[PDB]
Amino acid sequence: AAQTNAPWGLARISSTSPGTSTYYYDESAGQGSCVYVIDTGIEASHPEFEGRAQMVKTYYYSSRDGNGHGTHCAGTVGSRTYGVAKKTQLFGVKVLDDNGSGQYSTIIAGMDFVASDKNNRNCPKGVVASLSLGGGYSSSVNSAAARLQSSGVMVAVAAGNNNADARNYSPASEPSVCTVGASDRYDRRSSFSNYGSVLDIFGPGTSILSTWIGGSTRSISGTSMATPHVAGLAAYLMTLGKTTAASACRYIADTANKGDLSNIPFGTVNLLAYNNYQA
């Protein structure tokens, strides 16, 4: 299947060169998989989700996304027009407030919540969690991510937007999860993206068009945006039966486009997520 005039990031992940505008993917499109978006929430009613999204838990007064960040990431995972895995089921976990902020203890709890909750959902193809958040190093946060991964959920986390070594950030620095860096439409490491040996893979993260609250859309940038392309990709691949939760991160690195990125510091992988789609 192909999506013509797609957002640049979707085209990039199904291509072997930058500057294309078509997103080629298998029609299964993630059907049967589930992706947890652990963020500000998701505006489930957005037409773009076509009834495939729902809030399952909030750590605040409302289960809603008063910010839009969560909605945006969610859309990159699996919205109709803007998503990687167009037929995936989405679940929202609101650990972030409407200002886009949250305490570690609540983030931890949201993670522990997903590892249990998945037990009562029908996700035949596998389960993915996308965490577009992070702060200063915390072995507790790290350990929460490791548990989530250990439970059988494919965990993808943002590397952080400090133009610094991700080893100093959490959950970015947790080795057992998939740490995602950002790139731009010219195949350059995004100027804000973190780097370092802890990174696993890069994805499109500068100028990413996606859903927004109020039934709108907008373009924003960050490792937050790249994260969902990888989470969406993992769901897609799981559905196809190419890989599993415990082995998605490695598989994506194994089949990525290699050495194509510029501005990559020595010691950081030069790998760009790629779906290897072939008609």
Q: Which residues bind Na ion (CB under 5 A)?
A: 175, 200
177 is in an annotated binding site: yes
Active site residue 197: no
Residue 54 Cβ vs Na ion, minimum distance, rounded to whole Å = 29
Active site residue 229: no
Checking 212-216 for CB contacts under 8 A at 24+ apart, the result is 212/68, 212/71, 212/72, 212/75, 213/43, 213/46, 213/65, 213/66, 213/67, 213/68, 213/71, 214/43, 215/43, 215/45, 215/46, 215/47
Residue 151 Cβ vs Na ion, minimum distance, rounded to whole Å = 16
Residue 250 Cβ vs Na ion, minimum distance, rounded to whole Å = 9
Pick from 152, 133, 147: nearest CA to 248: 152
* Residue with smaller CB distance to Na ion, 29 or 155: 155
Catalytic residue of the set 46, 69, 72, 229: 69
* Residue with smaller CB distance to Na ion, 35 or 154: 154
Indicate the DSSP class of residue 79: -
Query: Using an 8 Å Cβ cutoff, are 157 and 148 in contact?
Result: no
Active site residue 224: yes
* Residue with smaller CB distance to Na ion, 90 or 129: 129
Residue 219 pairs in a beta bridge with 209
Q: Which residue ranges make up the annotated binding site for Ca(2+)?
A: 16, 175, 177, 200, 260
Residues with catalytic annotation?
39, 69, 224
Q: Which residue ranges make up the annotated binding site?
A: 16, 175, 177, 200, 260
